[PDB]
Amino acid sequence: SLRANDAPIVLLHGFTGWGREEMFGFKYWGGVRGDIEQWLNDNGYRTYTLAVGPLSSNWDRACEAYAQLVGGTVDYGAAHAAKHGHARFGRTYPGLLPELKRGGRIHIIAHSQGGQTARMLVSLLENGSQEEREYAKAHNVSLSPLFEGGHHFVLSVTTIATPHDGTTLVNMVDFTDRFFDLQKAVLEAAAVASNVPYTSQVYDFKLDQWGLRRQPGESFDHYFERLKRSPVWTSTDTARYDLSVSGAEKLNQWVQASPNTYYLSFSTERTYRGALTGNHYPELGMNAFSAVVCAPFLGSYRNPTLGIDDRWLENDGIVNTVSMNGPKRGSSDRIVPYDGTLKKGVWNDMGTYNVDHLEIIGVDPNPSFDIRAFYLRLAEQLASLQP
């Protein structure tokens, strides 16, 4: 399909994720398969990568993404900061694409919770925050342009394995310990140990607002024990909260689709249905961590109070497949099956792929998944979108 726009692509990770210089160069986008950003750039599709707080709230991450894109000091909003008890200002970025302030636009390709963050960035650009606007007026403090509303620079948002309606994983017994074991498993995939006090940061959680950071002589094991008991794990202003079924619905109540943006969703599944009661089990090849620690629960957990039934059992090892095609719980967004023509202001359900949560970004191997072809095909589709 002929190119219709020249907007660059911007990659955005989920509740794990790090910059290109982090993890000694092992890429979140590509993992053991390679470097996805490089493949796209080498094929004529200008691509950049964002790195935001993996455990931080989608709100915090959207503010971080904004500053990283246009340049400047991250501003979480005076009202938000005061309400949750963290710094109003975060780190300062040079800006990957300052041209966005003069008419330039982008295509955001997001994985996992990155999909929620991308949606929220669009919502904030379009409508800003009334609470922040009122607070700035009443307290005589500055206001970030992000909260003014009336802005637009995202041509499309593509989500891959995103928990738009949350994931029941959060309801597991011992979630807390298993979630950080997942972080350790991803570190191991990148050939990084969790019992070594590395002097270089290696994996920066970017918790400047909370005043948290791995200390000199501190291992990831020790650091994660502290994070478990910190506000980034115990507050409502967290990825943890937004990841839950309840929290995702809350997010859906205000984060809606913009009529000026194309939305694409890719779903993932890596399970088979059993013959006993219809529960779902991990297929051969699923990354070891998910197969042993998460999939069994995801494919068997039901919760009447939450409306979690049979349709929620199929999963990709981390997120329930039904949650991925687009926001539905507490959402007025429209979702339509891809019909050959991508449409604006609605979710274009691109289908379900037989790849697990980590395989889809290359962090876990899967020879049968042509990952390079998948992303190049996507880049071409995005480039074909009419502005």
Would you tell me which residues interact with Ca ion (CB under 5 A)? 285, 364, 366
60 contact, one of Zn ion, Cl ion, Na ion, none, CB 5-8 Å limit per kind: Zn ion
334 contact, one of Cl ion, Ca ion, Na ion, none, CB 5-8 Å limit per kind: none
316 is catalytic: yes
Q: Which of 56, 57, 112, 323 is catalytic?
A: 112
| Dist. CA 100–CA 288, nearest whole Å | 41
| Residue 111 known to bind ligand | no
| Dist. CA 286–CA 129, nearest whole Å | 41
Q: Give the position of tokens 């042509």.
A: 370
Q: Find the part of the chain contacting Zn ion (CB under 5 A) among 234-242, 285-293, 340-348, 375-383.
A: 234-242
Query: 50 - beta bridge partners?
Result: 12
112 contact, one of Ca ion, Zn ion, Na ion, none, CB 5-8 Å limit per kind: Na ion
**Minimum distance of Na ion from residue 358's CB (angstroms):** 8
Q: Find the part of the chain contacting Na ion (CB under 5 A) among 15-23, 162-170, 176-184, 255-263.
A: 15-23
Nearer to Na ion, 15 or 39 (CB): 15
Q: Find the part of the chain contacting Zn ion (CB under 5 A) among 55-63, 246-254, 283-291, 333-341.
A: 55-63
Strands of the chain, DSSP E: 9-12, 47-50, 72-75, 89-93, 106-111, 154-160, 262-268, 271-273, 280-282, 335-337, 347-353
Q: Are 354 and 22 in contact, with CB atoms under 8 Å apart?
A: no
Work out whether 237 is an interface residue with Zn ion (CB under 5 A).
yes
Of positions 8, 14, 285, 327, contacts Na ion by CB under 5 A: 14
Closest-CA residue to 247 (of 318, 306, 182): 306
| Dist. CA 373–CA 370, nearest whole Å | 5
| Dist. CA 378–CA 382, nearest whole Å | 6
Feature table: binding site for Zn(2+): 60, 80, 86, 237
Q: What does the binding site for Zn ion look like in residue numbers (CB under 5 A)?
A: 60, 237
